[PDB]
Short mmCIF file of N, CA and C in Angstrom, two decimals:
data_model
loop_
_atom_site.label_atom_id
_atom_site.label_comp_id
_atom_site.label_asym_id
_atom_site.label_seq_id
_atom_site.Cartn_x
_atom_site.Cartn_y
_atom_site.Cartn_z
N UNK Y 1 0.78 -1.26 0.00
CA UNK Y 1 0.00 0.00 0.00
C UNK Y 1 0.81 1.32 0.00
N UNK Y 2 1.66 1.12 1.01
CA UNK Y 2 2.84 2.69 1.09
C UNK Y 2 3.61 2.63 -0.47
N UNK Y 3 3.39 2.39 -1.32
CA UNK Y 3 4.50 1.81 -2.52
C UNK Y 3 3.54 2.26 -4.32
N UNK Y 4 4.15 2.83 -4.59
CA UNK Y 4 3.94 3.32 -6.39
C UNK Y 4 2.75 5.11 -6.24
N UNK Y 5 3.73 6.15 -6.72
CA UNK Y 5 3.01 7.09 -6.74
C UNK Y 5 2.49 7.31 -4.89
N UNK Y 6 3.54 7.36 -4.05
CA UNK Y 6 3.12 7.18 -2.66
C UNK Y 6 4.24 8.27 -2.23
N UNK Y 7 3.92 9.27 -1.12
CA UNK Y 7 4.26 10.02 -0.33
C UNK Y 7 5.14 9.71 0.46
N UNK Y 8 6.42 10.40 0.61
CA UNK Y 8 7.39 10.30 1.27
C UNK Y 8 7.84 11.54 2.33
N UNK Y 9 7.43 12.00 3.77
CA UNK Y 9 7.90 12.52 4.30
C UNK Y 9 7.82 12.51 5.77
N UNK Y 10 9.57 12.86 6.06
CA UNK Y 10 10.19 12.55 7.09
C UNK Y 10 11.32 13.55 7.67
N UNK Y 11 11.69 13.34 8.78
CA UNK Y 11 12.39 14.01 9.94
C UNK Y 11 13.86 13.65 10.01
N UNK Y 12 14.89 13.75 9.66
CA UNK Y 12 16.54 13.48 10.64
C UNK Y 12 17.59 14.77 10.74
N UNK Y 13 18.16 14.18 11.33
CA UNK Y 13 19.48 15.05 11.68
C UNK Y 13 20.79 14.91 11.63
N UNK Y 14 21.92 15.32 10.94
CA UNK Y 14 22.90 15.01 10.26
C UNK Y 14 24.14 15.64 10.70
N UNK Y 15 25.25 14.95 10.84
CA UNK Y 15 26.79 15.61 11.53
C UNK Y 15 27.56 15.51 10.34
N UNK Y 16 28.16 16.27 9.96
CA UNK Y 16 29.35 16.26 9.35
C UNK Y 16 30.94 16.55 9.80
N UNK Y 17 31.79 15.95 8.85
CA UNK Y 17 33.30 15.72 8.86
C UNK Y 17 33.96 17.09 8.98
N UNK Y 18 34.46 17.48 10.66
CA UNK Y 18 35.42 18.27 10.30
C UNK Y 18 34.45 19.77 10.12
N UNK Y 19 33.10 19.57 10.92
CA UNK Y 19 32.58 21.13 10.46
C UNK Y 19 32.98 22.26 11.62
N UNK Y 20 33.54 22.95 11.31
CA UNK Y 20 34.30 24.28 11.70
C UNK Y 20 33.23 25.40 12.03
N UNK Y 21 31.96 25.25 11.39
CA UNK Y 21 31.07 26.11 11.38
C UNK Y 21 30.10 25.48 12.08
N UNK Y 22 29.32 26.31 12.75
CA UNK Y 22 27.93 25.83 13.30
C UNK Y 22 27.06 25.78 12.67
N UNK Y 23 26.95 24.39 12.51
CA UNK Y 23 26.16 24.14 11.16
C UNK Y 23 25.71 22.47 12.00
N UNK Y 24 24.32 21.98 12.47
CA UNK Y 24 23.55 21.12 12.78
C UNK Y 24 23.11 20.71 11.31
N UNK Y 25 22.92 19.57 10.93
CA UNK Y 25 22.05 18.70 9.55
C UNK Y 25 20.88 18.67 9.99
N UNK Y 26 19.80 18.95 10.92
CA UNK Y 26 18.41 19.25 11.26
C UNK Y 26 17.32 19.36 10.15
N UNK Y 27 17.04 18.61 8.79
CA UNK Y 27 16.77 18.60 7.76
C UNK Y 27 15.42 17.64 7.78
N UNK Y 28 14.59 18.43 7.36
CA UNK Y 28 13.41 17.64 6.69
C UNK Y 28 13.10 17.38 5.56
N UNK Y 29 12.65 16.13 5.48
CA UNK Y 29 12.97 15.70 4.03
C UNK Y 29 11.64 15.02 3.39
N UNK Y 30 11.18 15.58 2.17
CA UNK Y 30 10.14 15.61 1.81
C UNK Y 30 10.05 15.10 0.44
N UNK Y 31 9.23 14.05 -0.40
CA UNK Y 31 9.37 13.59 -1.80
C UNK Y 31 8.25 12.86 -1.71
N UNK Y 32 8.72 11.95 -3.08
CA UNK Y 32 7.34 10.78 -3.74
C UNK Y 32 8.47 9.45 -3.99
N UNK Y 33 7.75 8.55 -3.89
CA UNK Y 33 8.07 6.93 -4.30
C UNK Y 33 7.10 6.80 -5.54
N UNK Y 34 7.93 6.99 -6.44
CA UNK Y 34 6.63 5.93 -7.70
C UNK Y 34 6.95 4.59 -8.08
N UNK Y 35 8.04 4.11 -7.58
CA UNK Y 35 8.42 2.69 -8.12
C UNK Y 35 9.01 1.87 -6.92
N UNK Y 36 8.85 0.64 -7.26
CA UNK Y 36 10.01 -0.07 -6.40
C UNK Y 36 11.35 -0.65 -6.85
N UNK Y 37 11.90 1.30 -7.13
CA UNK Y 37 13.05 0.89 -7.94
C UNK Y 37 13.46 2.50 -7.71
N UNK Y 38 13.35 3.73 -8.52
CA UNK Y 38 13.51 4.76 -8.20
C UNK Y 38 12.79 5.93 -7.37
N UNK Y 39 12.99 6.84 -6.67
CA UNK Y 39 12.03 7.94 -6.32
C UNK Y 39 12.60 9.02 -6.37
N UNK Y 40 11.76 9.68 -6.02
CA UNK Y 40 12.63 11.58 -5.57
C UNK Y 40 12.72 11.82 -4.30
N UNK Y 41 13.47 12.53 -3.64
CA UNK Y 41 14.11 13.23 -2.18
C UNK Y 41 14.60 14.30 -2.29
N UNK Y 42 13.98 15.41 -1.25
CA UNK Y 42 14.35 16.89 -1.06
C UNK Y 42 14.65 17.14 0.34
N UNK Y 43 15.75 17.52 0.76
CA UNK Y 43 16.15 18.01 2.22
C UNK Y 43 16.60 19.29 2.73
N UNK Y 44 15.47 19.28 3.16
CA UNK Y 44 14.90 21.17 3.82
C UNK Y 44 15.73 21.64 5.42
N UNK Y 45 17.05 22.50 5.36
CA UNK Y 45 17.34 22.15 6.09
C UNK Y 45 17.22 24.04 6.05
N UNK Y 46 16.26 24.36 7.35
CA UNK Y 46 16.55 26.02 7.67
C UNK Y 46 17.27 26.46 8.42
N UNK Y 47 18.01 27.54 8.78
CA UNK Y 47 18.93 27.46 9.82
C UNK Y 47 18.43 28.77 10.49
N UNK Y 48 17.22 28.80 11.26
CA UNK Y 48 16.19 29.57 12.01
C UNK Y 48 17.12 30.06 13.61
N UNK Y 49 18.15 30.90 13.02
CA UNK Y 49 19.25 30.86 14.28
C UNK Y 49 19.32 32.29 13.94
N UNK Y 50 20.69 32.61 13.13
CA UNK Y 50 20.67 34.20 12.40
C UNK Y 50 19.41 34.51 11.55
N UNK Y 51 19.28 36.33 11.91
CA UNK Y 51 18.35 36.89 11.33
C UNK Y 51 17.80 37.01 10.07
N UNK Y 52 18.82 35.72 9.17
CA UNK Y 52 18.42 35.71 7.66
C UNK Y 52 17.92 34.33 7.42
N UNK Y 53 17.23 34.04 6.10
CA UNK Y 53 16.72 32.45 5.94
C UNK Y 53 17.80 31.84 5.35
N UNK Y 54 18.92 31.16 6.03
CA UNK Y 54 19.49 30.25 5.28
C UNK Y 54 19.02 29.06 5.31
N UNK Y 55 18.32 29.23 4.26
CA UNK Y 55 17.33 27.55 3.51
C UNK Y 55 18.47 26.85 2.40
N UNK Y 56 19.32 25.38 3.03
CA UNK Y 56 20.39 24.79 2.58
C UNK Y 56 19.34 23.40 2.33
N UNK Y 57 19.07 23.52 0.81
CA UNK Y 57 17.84 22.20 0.54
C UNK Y 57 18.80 21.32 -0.25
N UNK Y 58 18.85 19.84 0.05
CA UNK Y 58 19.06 19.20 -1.04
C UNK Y 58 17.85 18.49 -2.33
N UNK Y 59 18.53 18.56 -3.41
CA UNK Y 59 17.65 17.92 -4.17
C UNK Y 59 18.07 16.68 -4.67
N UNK Y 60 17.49 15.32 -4.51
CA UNK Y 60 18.38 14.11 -4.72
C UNK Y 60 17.19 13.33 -5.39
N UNK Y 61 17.88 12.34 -6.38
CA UNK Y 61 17.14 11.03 -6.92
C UNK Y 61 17.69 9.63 -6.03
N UNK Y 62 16.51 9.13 -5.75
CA UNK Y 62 16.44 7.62 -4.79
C UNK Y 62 16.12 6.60 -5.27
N UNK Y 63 17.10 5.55 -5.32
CA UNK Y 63 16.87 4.58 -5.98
C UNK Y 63 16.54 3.31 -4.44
N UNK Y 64 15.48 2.97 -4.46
CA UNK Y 64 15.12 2.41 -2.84
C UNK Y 64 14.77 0.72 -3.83
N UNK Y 65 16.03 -0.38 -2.91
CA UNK Y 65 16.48 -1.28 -3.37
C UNK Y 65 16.06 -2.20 -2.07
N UNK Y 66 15.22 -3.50 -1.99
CA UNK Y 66 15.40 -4.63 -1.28
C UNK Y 66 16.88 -4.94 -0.64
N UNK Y 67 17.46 -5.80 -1.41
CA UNK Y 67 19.38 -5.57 -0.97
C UNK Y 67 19.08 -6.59 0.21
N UNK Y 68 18.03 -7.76 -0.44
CA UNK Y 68 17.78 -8.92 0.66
C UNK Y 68 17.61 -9.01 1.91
N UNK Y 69 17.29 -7.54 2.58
CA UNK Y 69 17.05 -7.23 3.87
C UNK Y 69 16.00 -8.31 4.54
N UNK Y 70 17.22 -9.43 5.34
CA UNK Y 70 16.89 -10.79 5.85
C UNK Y 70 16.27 -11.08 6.85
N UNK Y 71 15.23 -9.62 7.51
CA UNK Y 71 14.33 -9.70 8.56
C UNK Y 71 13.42 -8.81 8.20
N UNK Y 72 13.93 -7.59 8.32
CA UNK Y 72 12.79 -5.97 7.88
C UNK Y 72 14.12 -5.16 7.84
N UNK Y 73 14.58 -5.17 6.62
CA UNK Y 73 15.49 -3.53 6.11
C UNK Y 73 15.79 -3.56 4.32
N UNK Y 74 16.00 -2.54 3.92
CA UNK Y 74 16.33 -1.73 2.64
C UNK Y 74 17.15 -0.86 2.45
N UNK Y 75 17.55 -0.60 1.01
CA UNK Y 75 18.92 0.40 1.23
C UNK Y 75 17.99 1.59 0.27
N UNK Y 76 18.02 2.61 0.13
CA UNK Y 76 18.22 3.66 -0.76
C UNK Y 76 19.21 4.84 -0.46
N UNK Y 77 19.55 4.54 -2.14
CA UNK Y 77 20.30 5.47 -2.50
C UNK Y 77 20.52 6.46 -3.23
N UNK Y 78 20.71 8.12 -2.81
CA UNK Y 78 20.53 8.80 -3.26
C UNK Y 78 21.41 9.97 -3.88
N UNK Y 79 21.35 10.43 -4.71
CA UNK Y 79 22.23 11.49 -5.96
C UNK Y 79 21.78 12.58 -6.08
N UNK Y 80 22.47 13.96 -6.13
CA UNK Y 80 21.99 14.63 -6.14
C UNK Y 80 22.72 16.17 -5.96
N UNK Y 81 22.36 17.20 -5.80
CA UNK Y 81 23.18 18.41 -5.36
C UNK Y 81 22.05 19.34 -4.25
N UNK Y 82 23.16 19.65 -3.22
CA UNK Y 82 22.50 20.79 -2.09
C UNK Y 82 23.32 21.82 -2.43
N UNK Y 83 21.64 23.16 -2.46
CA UNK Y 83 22.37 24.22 -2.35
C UNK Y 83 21.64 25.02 -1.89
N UNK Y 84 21.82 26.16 -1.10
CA UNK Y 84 21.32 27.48 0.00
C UNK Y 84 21.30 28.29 -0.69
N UNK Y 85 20.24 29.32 -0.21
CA UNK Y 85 19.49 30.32 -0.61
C UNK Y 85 19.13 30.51 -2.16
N UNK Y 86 20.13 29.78 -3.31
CA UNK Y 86 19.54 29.43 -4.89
C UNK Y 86 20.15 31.18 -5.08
N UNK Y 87 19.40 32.01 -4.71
CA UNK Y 87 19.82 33.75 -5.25
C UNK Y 87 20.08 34.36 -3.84
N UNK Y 88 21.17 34.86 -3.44
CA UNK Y 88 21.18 35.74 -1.96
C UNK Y 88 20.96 37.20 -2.37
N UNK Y 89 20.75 38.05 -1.33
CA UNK Y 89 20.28 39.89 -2.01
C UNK Y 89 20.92 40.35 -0.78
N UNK Y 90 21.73 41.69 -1.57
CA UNK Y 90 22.21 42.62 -1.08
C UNK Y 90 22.17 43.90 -1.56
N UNK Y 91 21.73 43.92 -2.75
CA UNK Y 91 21.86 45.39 -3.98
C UNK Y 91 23.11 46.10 -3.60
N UNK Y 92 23.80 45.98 -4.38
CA UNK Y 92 25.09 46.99 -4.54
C UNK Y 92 24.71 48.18 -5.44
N UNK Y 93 24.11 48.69 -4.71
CA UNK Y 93 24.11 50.33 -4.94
C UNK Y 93 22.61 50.36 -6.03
N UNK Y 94 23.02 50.43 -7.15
CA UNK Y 94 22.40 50.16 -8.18
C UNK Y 94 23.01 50.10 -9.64
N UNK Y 95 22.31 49.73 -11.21
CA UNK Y 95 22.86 49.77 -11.96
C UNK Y 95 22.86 48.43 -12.63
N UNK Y 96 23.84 47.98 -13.24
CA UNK Y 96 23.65 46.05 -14.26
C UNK Y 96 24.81 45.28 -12.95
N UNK Y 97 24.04 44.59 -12.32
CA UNK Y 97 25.00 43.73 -10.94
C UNK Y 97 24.71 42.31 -11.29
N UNK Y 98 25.42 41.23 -11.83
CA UNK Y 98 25.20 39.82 -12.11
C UNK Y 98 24.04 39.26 -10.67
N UNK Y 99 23.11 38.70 -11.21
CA UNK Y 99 22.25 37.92 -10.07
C UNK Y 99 23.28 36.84 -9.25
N UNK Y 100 23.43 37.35 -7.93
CA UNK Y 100 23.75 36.20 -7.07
C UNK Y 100 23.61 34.16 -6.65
N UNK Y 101 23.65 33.86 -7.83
CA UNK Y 101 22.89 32.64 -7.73
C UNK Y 101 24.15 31.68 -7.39
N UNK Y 102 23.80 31.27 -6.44
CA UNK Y 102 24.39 29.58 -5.37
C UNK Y 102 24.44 28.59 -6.24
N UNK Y 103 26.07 28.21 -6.43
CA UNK Y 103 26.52 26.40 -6.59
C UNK Y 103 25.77 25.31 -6.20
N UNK Y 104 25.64 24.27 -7.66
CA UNK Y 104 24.81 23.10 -7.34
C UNK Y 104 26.18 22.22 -6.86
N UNK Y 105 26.15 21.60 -5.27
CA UNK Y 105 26.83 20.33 -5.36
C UNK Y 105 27.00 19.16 -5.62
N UNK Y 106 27.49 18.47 -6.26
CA UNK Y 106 27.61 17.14 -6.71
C UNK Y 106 27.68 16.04 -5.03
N UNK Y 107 26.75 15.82 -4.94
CA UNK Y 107 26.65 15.02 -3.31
C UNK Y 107 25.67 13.44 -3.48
N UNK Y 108 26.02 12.56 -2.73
CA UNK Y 108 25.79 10.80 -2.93
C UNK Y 108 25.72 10.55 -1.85
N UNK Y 109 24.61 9.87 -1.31
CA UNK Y 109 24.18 9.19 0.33
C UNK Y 109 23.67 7.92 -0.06
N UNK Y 110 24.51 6.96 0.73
CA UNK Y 110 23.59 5.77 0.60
C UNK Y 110 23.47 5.49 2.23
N UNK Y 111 21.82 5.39 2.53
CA UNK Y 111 21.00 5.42 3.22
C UNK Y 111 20.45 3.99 3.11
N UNK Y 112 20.07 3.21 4.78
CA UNK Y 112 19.60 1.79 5.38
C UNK Y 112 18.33 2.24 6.41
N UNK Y 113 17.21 2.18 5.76
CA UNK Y 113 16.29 2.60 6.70
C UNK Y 113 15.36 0.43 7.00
N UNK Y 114 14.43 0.77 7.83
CA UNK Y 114 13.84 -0.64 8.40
C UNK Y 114 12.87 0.15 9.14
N UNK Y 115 11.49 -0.99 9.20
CA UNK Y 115 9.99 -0.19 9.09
C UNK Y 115 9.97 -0.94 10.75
N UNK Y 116 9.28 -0.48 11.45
CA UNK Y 116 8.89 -0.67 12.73
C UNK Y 116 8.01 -1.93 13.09
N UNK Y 117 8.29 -2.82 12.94
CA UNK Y 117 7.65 -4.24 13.23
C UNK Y 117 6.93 -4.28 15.01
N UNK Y 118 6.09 -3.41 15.12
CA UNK Y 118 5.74 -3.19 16.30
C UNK Y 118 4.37 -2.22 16.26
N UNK Y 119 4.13 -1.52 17.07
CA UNK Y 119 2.97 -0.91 17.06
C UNK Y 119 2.90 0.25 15.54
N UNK Y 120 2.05 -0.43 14.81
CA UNK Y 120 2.05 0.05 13.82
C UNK Y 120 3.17 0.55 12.99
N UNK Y 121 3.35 -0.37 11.29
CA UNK Y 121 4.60 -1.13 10.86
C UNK Y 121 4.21 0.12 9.61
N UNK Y 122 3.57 0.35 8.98
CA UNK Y 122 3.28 1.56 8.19
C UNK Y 122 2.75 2.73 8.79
N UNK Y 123 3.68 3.04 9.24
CA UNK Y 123 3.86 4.61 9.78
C UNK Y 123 5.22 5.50 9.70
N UNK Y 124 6.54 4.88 10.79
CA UNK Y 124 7.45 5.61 10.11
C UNK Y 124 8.89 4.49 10.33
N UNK Y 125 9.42 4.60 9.27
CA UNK Y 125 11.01 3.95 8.98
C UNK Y 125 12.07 4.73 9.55
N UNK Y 126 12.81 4.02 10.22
CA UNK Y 126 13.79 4.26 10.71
C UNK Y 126 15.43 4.39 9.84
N UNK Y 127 15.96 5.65 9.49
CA UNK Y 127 16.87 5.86 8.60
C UNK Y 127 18.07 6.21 9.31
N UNK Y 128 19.24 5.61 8.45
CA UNK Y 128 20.51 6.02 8.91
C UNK Y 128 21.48 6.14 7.25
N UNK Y 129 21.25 6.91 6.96
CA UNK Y 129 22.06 7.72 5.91
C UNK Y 129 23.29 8.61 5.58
N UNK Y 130 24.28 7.70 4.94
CA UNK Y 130 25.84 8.62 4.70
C UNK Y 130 26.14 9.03 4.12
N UNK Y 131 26.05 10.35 3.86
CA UNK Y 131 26.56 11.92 2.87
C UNK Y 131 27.62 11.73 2.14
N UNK Y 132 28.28 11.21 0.96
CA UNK Y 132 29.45 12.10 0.85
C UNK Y 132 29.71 12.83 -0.47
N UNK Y 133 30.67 13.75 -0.58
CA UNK Y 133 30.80 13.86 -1.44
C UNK Y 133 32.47 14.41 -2.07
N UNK Y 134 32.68 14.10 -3.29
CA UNK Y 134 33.85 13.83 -4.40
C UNK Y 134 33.97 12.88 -3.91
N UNK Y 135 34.99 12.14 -4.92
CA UNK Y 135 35.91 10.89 -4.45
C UNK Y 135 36.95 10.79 -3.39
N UNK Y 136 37.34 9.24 -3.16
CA UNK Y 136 38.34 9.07 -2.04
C UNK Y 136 37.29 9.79 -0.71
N UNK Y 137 38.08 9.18 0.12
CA UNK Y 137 37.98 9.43 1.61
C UNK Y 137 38.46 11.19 1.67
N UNK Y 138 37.16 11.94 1.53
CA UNK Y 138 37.27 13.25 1.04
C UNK Y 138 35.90 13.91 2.44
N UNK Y 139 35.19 13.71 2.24
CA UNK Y 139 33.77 14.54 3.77
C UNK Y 139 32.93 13.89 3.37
N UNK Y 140 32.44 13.46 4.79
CA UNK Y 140 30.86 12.59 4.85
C UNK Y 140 30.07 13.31 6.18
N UNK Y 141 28.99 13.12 5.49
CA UNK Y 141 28.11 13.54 6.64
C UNK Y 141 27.20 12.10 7.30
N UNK Y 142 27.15 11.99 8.49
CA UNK Y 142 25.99 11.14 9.25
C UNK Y 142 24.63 11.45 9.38
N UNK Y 143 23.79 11.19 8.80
CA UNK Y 143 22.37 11.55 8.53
C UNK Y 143 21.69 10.33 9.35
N UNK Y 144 20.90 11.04 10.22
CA UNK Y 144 20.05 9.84 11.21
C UNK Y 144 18.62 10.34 11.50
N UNK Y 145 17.43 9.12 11.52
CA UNK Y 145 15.98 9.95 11.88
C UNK Y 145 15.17 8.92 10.91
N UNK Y 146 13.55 9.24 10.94
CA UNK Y 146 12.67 8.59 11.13
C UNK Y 146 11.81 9.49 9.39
N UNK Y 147 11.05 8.50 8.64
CA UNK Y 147 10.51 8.89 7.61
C UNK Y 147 8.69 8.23 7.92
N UNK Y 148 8.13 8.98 7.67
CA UNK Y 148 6.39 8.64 7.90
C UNK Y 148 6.13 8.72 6.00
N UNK Y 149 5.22 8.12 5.94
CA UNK Y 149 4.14 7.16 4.90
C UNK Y 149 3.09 8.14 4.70
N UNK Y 150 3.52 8.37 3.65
CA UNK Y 150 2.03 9.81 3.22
C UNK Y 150 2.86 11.43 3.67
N UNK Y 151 2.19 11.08 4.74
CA UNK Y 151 2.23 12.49 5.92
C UNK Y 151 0.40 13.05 5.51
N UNK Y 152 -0.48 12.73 6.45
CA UNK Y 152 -1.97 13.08 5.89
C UNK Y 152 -2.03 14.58 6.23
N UNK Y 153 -1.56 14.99 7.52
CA UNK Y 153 -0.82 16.33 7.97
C UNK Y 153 -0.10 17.12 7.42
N UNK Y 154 -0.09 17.34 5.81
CA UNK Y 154 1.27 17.57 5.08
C UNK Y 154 1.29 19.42 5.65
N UNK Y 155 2.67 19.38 6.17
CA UNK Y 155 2.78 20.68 7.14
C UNK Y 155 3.91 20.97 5.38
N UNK Y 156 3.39 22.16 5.34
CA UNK Y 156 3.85 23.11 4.20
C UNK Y 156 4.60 24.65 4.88
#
């Protein structure tokens, strides 16, 4: 029932390698499943701290794979690029100023979530998902948290 043309959204929180900046992965992540093979994934991560919206979203394709999970688990994996604010504003003065528009990153998580075999098993999956990105042993992020089925509540 949760599966083809079906709602995907969910809650985690993510550490990364070596971050220097205060910067929490606190990201909600919101998409569709149409197959049992590929989907889409978006991760909404606001940083509701300083007085400006830094909205750092990823946009990723999910390929959500069996991978013989020999009790209750699955892998998906996802491709994609994150990037913040898309256009930032400052106006320099006035006059012809190039639009400010934000780098797409080239970023790859493969993510092991498993559905709750307990009080109610279609509701939400339990995810543990690893960021990285370029090649070689280069920065990963730890992505951890819980995905719900639908969302009938869809908070916009």
């Amino acid at each position: 029932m949760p599966k083809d043309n079906t709602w995907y959204t969910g809650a985690k929180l993510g550490w990364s390698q070596y971050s220097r900046e205060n910067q929490l992965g606190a990201g909600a992540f919101g998409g569709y499943q149409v197959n049992p093979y590929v989907g889409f994934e978006m991760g909404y991560d606001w940083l509701g701290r300083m007085p400006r919206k830094a909205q750092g979203v990823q946009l990723t394709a999910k390929l959500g794979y069996p991978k013989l999970g020999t009790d209750d688990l699955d892998i998906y994996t996802r491709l994609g690029g994150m990037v913040w604010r898309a256009d930032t504003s400052d106006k320099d003065g006035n006059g012809y100023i190039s639009a400010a528009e934000a780098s797409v990153s080239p970023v790859f998580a493969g993510g092991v979530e498993y559905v709750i075999r307990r009080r109610i098993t279609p509701e939400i999956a339990t995810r543990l998902e690893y960021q990285w990105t370029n090649n070689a042993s280069d920065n990963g992020m730890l992505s951890l948290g819980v995905s719900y089925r639908f969302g009938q509540g869809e908070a916009a």
